[PDB]
Amino acid sequence: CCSWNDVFQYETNKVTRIQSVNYGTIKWILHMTVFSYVSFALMSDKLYQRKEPLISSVHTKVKGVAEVTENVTKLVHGIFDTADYTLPLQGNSFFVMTNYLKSEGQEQKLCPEYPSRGKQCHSDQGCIKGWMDPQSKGIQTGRCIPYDQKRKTCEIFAWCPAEEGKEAPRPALLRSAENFTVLIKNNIDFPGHNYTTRNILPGMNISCTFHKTWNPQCPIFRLGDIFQEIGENFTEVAVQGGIMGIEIYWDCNLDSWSHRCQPKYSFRRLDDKYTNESLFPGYNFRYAKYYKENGMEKRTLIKAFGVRFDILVFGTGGKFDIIQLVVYIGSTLSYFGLATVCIDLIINTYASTCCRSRVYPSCKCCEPCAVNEYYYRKKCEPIVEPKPTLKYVSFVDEPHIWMVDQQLLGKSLQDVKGQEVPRPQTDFLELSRLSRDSPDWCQCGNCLPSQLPENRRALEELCCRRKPGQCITTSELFSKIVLSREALQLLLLYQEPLLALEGEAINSKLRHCAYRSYATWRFVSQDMADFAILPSCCRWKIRKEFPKTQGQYSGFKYPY
Amino acid sequence: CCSWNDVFQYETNKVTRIQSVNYGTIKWILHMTVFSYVSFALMSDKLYQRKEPLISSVHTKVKGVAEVTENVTKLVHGIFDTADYTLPLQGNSFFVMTNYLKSEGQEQKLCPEYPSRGKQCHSDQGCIKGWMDPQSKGIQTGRCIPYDQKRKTCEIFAWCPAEEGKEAPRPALLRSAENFTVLIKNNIDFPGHNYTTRNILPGMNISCTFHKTWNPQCPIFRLGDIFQEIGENFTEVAVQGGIMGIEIYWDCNLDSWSHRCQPKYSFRRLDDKYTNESLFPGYNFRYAKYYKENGMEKRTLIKAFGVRFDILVFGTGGKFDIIQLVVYIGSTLSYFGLATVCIDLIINTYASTCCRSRVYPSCKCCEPCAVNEYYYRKKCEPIVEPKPTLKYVSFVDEPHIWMVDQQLLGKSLQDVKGQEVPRPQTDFLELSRLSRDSPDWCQCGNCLPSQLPENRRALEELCCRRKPGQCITTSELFSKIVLSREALQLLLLYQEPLLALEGEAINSKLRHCAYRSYATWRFVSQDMADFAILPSCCRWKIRKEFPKTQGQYSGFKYPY
Amino acid sequence: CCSWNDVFQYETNKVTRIQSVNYGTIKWILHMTVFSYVSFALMSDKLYQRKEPLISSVHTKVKGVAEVTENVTKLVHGIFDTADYTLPLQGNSFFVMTNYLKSEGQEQKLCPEYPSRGKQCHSDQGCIKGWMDPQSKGIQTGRCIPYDQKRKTCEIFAWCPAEEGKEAPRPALLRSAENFTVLIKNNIDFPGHNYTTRNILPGMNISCTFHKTWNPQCPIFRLGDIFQEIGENFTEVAVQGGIMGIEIYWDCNLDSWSHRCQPKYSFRRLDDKYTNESLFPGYNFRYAKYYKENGMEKRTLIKAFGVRFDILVFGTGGKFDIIQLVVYIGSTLSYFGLATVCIDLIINTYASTCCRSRVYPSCKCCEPCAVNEYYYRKKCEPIVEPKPTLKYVSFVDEPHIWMVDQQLLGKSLQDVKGQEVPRPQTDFLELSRLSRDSPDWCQCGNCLPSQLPENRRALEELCCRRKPGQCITTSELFSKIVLSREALQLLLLYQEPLLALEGEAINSKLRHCAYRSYATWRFVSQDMADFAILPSCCRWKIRKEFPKTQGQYSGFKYPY
Numbered sequence A, B, C: 001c002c003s004w005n006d007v008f009q010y011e012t013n014k015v016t017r018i019q020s021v022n023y024g025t026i027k028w029i030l031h032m033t034v035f036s037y038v039s040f041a042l043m044s045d046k047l048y049q050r051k052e053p054l055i056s057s058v059h060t061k062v063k064g065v066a067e068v069t070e071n072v073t074k075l076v077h078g079i080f081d082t083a084d085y086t087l088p089l090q091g092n093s094f095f096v097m098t099n100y101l102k103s104e105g106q107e108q109k110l111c112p113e114y115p116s117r118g119k120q121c122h123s124d125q126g127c128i129k130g131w132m133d134p135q136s137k138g139i140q141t142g143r144c145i146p147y148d149q150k151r152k153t154c155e156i157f158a159w160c161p162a163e164e165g166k167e168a169p170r171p172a173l174l175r176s177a178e179n180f181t182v183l184i185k186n187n188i189d190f191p192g193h194n195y196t197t198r199n200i201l202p203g204m205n206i207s208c209t210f211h212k213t214w215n216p217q218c219p220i221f222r223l224g225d226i227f228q229e230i231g232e233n234f235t236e237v238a239v240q241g242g243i244m245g246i247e248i249y250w251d252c253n254l255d256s257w258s259h260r261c262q263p264k265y266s267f268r269r270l271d272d273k274y275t276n277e278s279l280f281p282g283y284n285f286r287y288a289k290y291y292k293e294n295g296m297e298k299r300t301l302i303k304a305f306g307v308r309f310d311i312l313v314f315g316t317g318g319k320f321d322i323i324q325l326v327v328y329i330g331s332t333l334s335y336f337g338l339a340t341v342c343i344d345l346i347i348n349t350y351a352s353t354c355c356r357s358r359v360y361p362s363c364k365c366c367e368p369c370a371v372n373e374y375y376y377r378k379k380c381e382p383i384v385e386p387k388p389t390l391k392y393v394s395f396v397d398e399p400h401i402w403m404v405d406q407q408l409l410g411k412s413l414q415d416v417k418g419q420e421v422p423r424p425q426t427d428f429l430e431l432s433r434l435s436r437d438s439p440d441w442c443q444c445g446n447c448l449p450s451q452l453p454e455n456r457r458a459l460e461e462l463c464c465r466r467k468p469g470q471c472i473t474t475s476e477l478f479s480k481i482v483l484s485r486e487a488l489q490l491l492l493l494y495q496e497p498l499l500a501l502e503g504e505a506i507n508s509k510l511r512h513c514a515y516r517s518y519a520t521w522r523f524v525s526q527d528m529a530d531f532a533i534l535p536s537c538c539r540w541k542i543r544k545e546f547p548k549t550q551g552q553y554s555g556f557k558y559p560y
Ligand SMILES: *[C@@H]1O[C@H](CO)[C@@H](O[C@@H]2O[C@H](CO)[C@@H](O)[C@H](O)[C@H]2NC(C)=O)[C@H](O)[C@H]1NC(C)=O
Pocket: A175, A176, A177, A178, A179
């Protein structure tokens, strides 16, 4: 099985070099196109780079103040700075108040609730008892009675008087909260690639303001500009708050030869503009300060509407990795065989006879493509599975050879039908040298009944031709090639120069060589010479020229 | 090197088309299986799609209130709404209080600390001085004395009296914080694919509540159902707080023909249930309000235990990309050669004689697989490296040819052993035409010593056979083929019809052609005809028939 | 086109098995190298694993207190615990105060601002009116007058007196905030792989402190160590706050046979150390408590500088996926043909005559590589596109055959130049058997003008040799092979043994067979035997031996 010489074996694929401009041109342009697409994808998607998602940290600083005068009994003149509207978070998100309601005497008692649009209840003692409403903050025993002038509400155990249920003002308060300035210091890192960077670099202008075209890299933003860049109106969002999103996209190429790693800023409204009224439309929150005055545990509650800005820092950093390039090249290497596949398809399609039957006469421009057929004769070598039932029979009348692959079921082989096969080119180089008692299944006269078992007798039942005429044995070459004793002796000497030469039982080898000679004569290819069935007239002629004394003649046997 | 015709060269692969049902069947079923697996992986993992992680923004709204009566000197009836237990964050995380302790007279002085289970210290002045305990909030000078009835503690500089060290109540306060409702508005975006969507869509029911089977898409959640869906008990988590996680998974397919992009909700307890007592088991925090009463800078501190719900939004959006499909197809194209590899392995395995020696007689079912061997004869063409030491020698007695690859170290070539090589099929188509003073290393009588340098004399030392007998020169074909002057003249005319024909020094070409004729006679293949070593008898017979007048006979020379 | 037998066809690639140690060695070592690199990349990058990013939840607990004495009119002694400096967030980020300024009587009035380094304004009424400064919290009408001793500031409507503009103390307050301890409980999950784990496991030491080498897996951290591990100074960061980042990297392998999933802790300063003074250098925030005293709505504001620690949890979990392994193997399978490509390149390079002209004589070590040329003769079979203009002509004088691919534009074919082609090896096995009125373009004497249309007359204008001499027709083999009637009759009988044999119009077949015989004689390969152009002398000799009675002689016709 395994030998030391077997290890050092190597197999080269046999090929034939076709000299043609069409095949070479389509080959080269297909190779160039697939190479161009591969390189384009490589340099566009940067598939040679291992990517990694960043890790981000954000620091927000909101600077700006707003004057606002309370509603006139007594009038107030107040100022709002970052200490009040801004929250202690100050990282990755920040709140900018744009409207506020306040209740000073918030304390626990059994007063009613504010009448909303639908909450206006005129019935007396109709409300549920111990309902624990999510709308009104207190658990209620109904006892509905009027505290307003022309309306009423249920008796609630919430913080009183008249805290919830009130709508926001219109126009919005704190309209000066649009020129406020946000400084966003963002620091991103790629730990696998080990590259840390940040938004602000040395030399950046401090007094800049972000704009889409003039100074995009400036990390200083104005809220009005944020809302105007996407067409949003700051006033309606100031009446009822919202949720904005500052997208910071990093597309970082950490390669030194093309190093670029900077952010791109975008803005997107996060809260649903057209949202249901039952759901909480805007972003709001209600917080209070607790205190004890006159012995009563009480508090003061303010509900603030404003815009929450989510700073969404995302991106990807790519760095050259050899393994990714290797995998991509290994994937794309298979496409270079597209040219060979297409050309082989062309050759196999134009080699068929259907192109000569229908295509070439009708089209009349694919006529020179018949050349492809010749390439098929140089590309393919059709063989057949040497089955035991495989047989080959020839007839002088017809030009082709019949492949009788079917099995014998007692019927005479002369009438069995098979697939025609064209005879080979005969290798013209090697060829260029100097009474009526028949079995009734032959058309000639020289046939003879076969002497074999009846189960296997139909194999020898073959004739030299399909219709009556001259027998092939009467030809001039049959006497000279098939059973010319000098010729067979010369052939055997060529195979074994020291043969017995009329010794003991030499006629068997001469008979076998005569069978092989007739086979190679009619069936040129050695694949077809084997598994050939000679006719009875020639078989028994050869047997007469080289009889067997003390034994029967064994017919065709499976060689392999 | 390079020519314009060399660019237009295309090389096809020579093949032989086997007609067999077994090979074709296994080829087609293997191709179908690999194609089916490739398509299955492509459609399941969606490898034709470029994926992208989402960017999310969450907005939480907790609605629900809870009545609770303080411990009875005086009794207090209180209500808790979203203003108190909920925090100002309101995005991506929210706290829901489920237990609380409070201390009103929190002020700075040198009073003792609360006695815990292990913190109970009965020693007198045994505690460390200036220890700065992390457990107790104050730095301690020991001075341990009793302030309780039957227990004592060290003197601490913490906010007093007796704030820390106290356990939580059991049962939990604010047990009504289980029917509380959470509205989670989640807006997600794929910026690379440029697709923004949100949890709540138009037409969704407002009064719905989340359930695993009935209404999963409802973003309204009940706190009790969240714990009950995973078997968690809300009471024990209400006594000592915890951390829950609302996982929102997006598996978005942005292709129009199969567009689906909606969330899936799941719940998972984040804090370790079985955790150490030394570590802080539950989620809690202690915050206060600062105030000045009677001139003393003081505060009131409350420690709240509750459940922190982390809304973990994650997922992936896939969109059709051509480069990913190209890479995947290029990767999977190599698997289509699996059928060819397997069939070639089958052919190369069943071609060896090992299968005929052991496998076929024993098994008796692999008998028809010997046909594969024939395919090997049509697939492979074994050749040998034409080394300078490569030689071929034949013997009329033995049927095979010996490959003497070994080098001559002075030993006679007649006894050198080599690897047997079977003679070819002889190309039957082209063949079907019409006293005792020996060197003592030969076995015939016609041998003669070689006239060459002693260093290179052993090459010609070869005989026509291994054992005594008739010499090959006495054969009938030797006189007709090898040195028949008419035959060699005809061959030379076939190569060059205008030869000198008995002119000056024609015997050299006749001698060379006679050597080639004997080689092709014994060593059929031209690869074996070259590098063949003739015996001394035939060599000197040919030299006698075609002598060299005024020069020595140059032996075998490396042609390449 | 399509047949049931055509489906079961399978094609094996023809190969020739080379027996050489060099080729086998380079093949095997190249295969081993590419296999080793593939396995190394697979086991290093874990490309057989599908990766997934984690989802994290962090819970922070800061323990530690700090004593601090206020500046001495009256002196104060106070303690700071986690209730005050820590924020209610307690998840994924926490604040640790390291400096504080405070203003008690913060209230709204028209007092001036604190004079900074540049804010010191000496002009009288020079400041802008209604400027709404971001620097000072109040909107200002100028009215600049002095309130300090030797300096002045504009009149501001901010919360007064002298809140903003003040620098931080140096040394920093709360220097005891360096031994503070942080417990970080991090729970991570891989939902696609469905694997949940956490930082703390059973059996971990509770009293441990994090160290790089001794106990890295301890999740308890000291704030001083976090700065000392990276060389940062805690005092300068305590004076003016900063931002730190605790990186928690997960490299989880969820395969059971190599299961390891634990965090790695690193620390990185997030805020820019060397940052502009105009920008806010350190991390700080100003918050207040609101109250009413003496009827005035007032507040007390404290500005805190401290370190914000961002717990950046990230990582990746890999789990065995068959599809990823299949894709990777399909990608890397193409590299196994690298050995075949390299060996074919070697064979095609060392097969050219360029290596024998320049390389082998000069180098003298690549001499035995000429053997590769022989492999080319066994690998490649160069053919030519059978164009209509393709022609072949031979001459007895010259040894090679001329390929006349050019078209006939009326010029005589005898003088047309073409590319030389070497004659084949002649298949020595098959060959080893037993007056002055010329056209003036030939050089022999037996030429004759051609009888064809003038447009196609130049095709037959060919001679048997390039220079004068003996005509090829006078050769001895011409009379025996080309026009020996017995030979042609035997050949035709071999093709069809039942020919008419001197019947009606048999001379046409004999003439065609004589043309084919001369072609196969001079042009051995059947590819070159076709498309051959015989000379006028031999052509008209053959026509004289086999005349045509009642018709003209049709010249060479395109067979395909
Ligand atoms: C926000 O800022 C803009 C720009 O400073 C204000 O628009 C100016 O308002 C002042 C008020 O006296 C006037 O000078 C002009 O009406 C505006 N100036 C310019 C150059 O247009 C705006 O009033 C501010 N407040 C908001 C929008 O609420």
